[PDB]
């Protein structure tokens, strides 16, 4: 319930760290921006993974583990998309 809101915010934060770093890049280098892409996707994946662990450890029903894990997957994916768009702005 509040777990939706916490994750949606946390994942939005990730794409802002990208939005910032890409914009000063916008303001060796093509190599640099591909590195930042791989890092921020690796941050989204890692956080996804972390949340799934915490979810699977909770004493809740499977249906609930399923709703929560799918909520969290969808945001993580929405973030990979939004960040994939920023690499294209460079490339």
């Amino acid at each position: 319930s509040d777990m939706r809101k916490d994750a949606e915010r946390r994942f939005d934060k990730f794409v802002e760290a990208a939005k910032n770093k890409f914009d000063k890049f916008k303001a060796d280098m093509k190599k640099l921006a591909r590195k930042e892409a791989e890092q921020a996707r690796r941050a989204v994946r890692n956080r996804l993974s972390e949340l799934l662990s915490k979810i699977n450890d909770m004493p809740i029903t499977n249906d609930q583990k399923k709703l929560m894990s799918n909520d969290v997957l969808k945001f993580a994916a929405e973030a990979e998309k939004k960040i994939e768009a920023l690499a294209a702005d460079a490339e």
Partner: antibody, heavy 120, light 107 residues
Framework: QVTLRESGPALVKPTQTLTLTCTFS??????????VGWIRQPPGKALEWLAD???????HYNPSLKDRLTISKDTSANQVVLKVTNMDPADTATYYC????????????WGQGTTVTVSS | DIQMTQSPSTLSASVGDRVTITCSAS?????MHWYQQKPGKAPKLLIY???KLASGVPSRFSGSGSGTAFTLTISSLQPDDFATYYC?????????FGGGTKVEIKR
């Protein structure tokens, strides 16, 4: 291409232990969300879920097989092993492994199954 | 632990008929899944999350329901829909399947 492939003996004597092994590829038990489960089907009867294991190493077993099951994983080898103790003739069945996800809580990909006969 | 009853357990119908299989559960589940199994093959997932279609599954298949009562529908039976169909619940441990329903063809 997600594939699973069950292996083990076709024949087991009554009271002995059966050791089954699932080998898979196209996915990994190191990935968050992933699970492998075992299901069996006696000849001409219904499917019966036996066990599963998750990527965080959490396990579940069917109480109907009360204490005869051990499941375990080898992530690096992409292999899950299932051990069934004190086999009796009613355990004669086709044994299947299949892939499950915390997003699904259902099996979307199965091996072809391996047939086990309990007999002297 | 949740047990499911399928009706009928056996069924014959002609090619082109509408066929319905019901799976009532012993208590509430959030979702029902359906497997199709042909002669000496592994079960293939057919319908998941109650009404959503799996891949390589024609549109003539569909599911509905909620709570304890669910249906699988084949809207125009084909010869290759010959199989045994099982419902399956993953909402609770242990996981369980219905007893099955044999679909046979009349010609």
């Amino acid at each position: 291409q997600v594939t699973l492939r069950e292996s083990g003996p076709a024949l087991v004597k009554p009271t002995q232990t059966l050791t089954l092994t699932c080998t898979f590829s196209g996915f990994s038990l190191s990935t968050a969300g992933m699970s492998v489960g075992w299901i069996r089907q006696p000849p001409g009867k219904a499917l019966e879920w036996l066990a599963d294991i998750w990527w965080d190493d959490k396990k579940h077993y069917n109480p109907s097989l009360k204490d005869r099951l051990t499941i375990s994983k080898d992530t690096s080898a992409n292999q899950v092993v299932l051990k069934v103790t004190n086999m009796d003739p009613a355990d004669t069945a086709t044994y299947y492994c299949a892939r499950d996800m915390i997003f699904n809580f259902y099996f979307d990909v199965w091996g072809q199954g391996t047939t086990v006969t309990v007999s002297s | 632990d949740i047990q499911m009853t399928q009706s009928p357990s056996t069924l014959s119908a002609s090619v082109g008929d509408r066929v319905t299989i019901t799976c009532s559960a012993s208590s509430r589940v959030g979702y029902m899944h359906w497997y199709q199994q042909k002669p000496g093959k592994a079960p293939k997932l057919l319908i998941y999350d109650t009404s959503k279609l799996a891949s390589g599954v024609p549109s003539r298949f569909s599911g509905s329901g909620s709570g304890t009562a669910f249906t699988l529908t084949i809207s125009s039976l084909q010869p290759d829909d010959f199989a045994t169909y099982y419902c399956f619940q993953g909402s609770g441990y242990p996981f369980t399947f219905g007893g099955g329903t044999k679909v046979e063809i009349k010609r």
